[PDB]
Amino acid sequence: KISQYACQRRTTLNNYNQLFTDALDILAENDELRENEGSCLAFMRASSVLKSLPFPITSMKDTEGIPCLGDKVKSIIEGIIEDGESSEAKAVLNDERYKSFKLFTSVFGVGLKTAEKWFRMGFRTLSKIQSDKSLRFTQMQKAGFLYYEDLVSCVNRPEAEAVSMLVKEAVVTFLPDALVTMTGGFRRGKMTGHDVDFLITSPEATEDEEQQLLHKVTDFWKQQGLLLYCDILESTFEKFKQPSRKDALDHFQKCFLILKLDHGRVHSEKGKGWKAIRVDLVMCPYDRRAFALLGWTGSRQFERDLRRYATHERKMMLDNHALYDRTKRVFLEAESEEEIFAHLGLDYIEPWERNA
Ligand SMILES: Nc1ncnc2c1ncn2[C@@H]1O[C@H](COP(=O)(O)CP(=O)(O)OP(=O)(O)O)[C@@H](O)[C@H]1O
């Protein structure tokens, strides 16, 4: 029996139900835009469970025994079986508000509120926004427009590996014992991504050394002329706080960057000679490295279901910093992700199996 939880499913990149899940993902995105959180969640859970199937749905009988498939979702599946298209997803793709929100939020630094503001001002194209002489842009949006074409082209694996080399070379210059791990989509086996994410941790660094590393590494890149954008968020981490009851917040020190990646550093099959790459770095205390790795690997749906399962099924509280057992009244320690899954009574799910 297929579990309702993504953390009890193996979800690999060979999606046999892309016709159904692309439509359900569009409908979920539109519900997010229309602030309908409930309908958004129902479409996301249905899309997630179909992504886990080892075969394509070709009839309504194939949906028997599958959880998270309500009446609304089954009507959408029936319509796609009928003529290979979703009339519901097609109407969203042609909606002017949806098209504007997708286009405007494709810019780094533009979220839901700014996209809504520009739409209500009558803007529909990025050309009209960028050339407007009355609009005022944040430093994040200025970088978003300046490096737009590079950032929208996405990052491939030779580029992600080239960025990994740069990150490791910079980090070990200040902390030679530091462990640098590529997380996010690339760790889940994806061929492309919108950014490259890393977890950095050091077994011997002090509290102050841990705090200064991201400042030292970004100053080094700024000196080399590689830092195109930088935003460092200071840590608000509390060693003895209970994990979140909430989409959990990450309190570790982190930075959101845009780096200049020279073409000569990329060893691939194939203009200006460089590409702007979105890079996120997270620094965590050594003892919390397994919780942080698990939270930063994703997918978002896998993380949500992991935390939901921990709370509802095990009376445990899980977040990126810790695992707390409410019955035993103890924090549970882990040196690896495998130990976290064992504490939760879950079969270990490999990172490439977390594409929920
Ligand atoms: N800018 C950011 N802010 C907060 N968390 C982030 C983050 N970037 C990465 N993460 C964390 O690490 C995982 C990957 O996050 P993202 O970079 O936002 C999407 P992704 O799964 O890596 O697809 P992508 O390859 O297109 O970026 C998620 O589990 C998320 O919690």
Ligand SMILES: [Co+2]
């Ligand atoms: Co990412």
Ligand SMILES: [Co+2]
């Ligand atoms: Co990221």
Ligand code: NA
């Ligand atoms: Na955006």
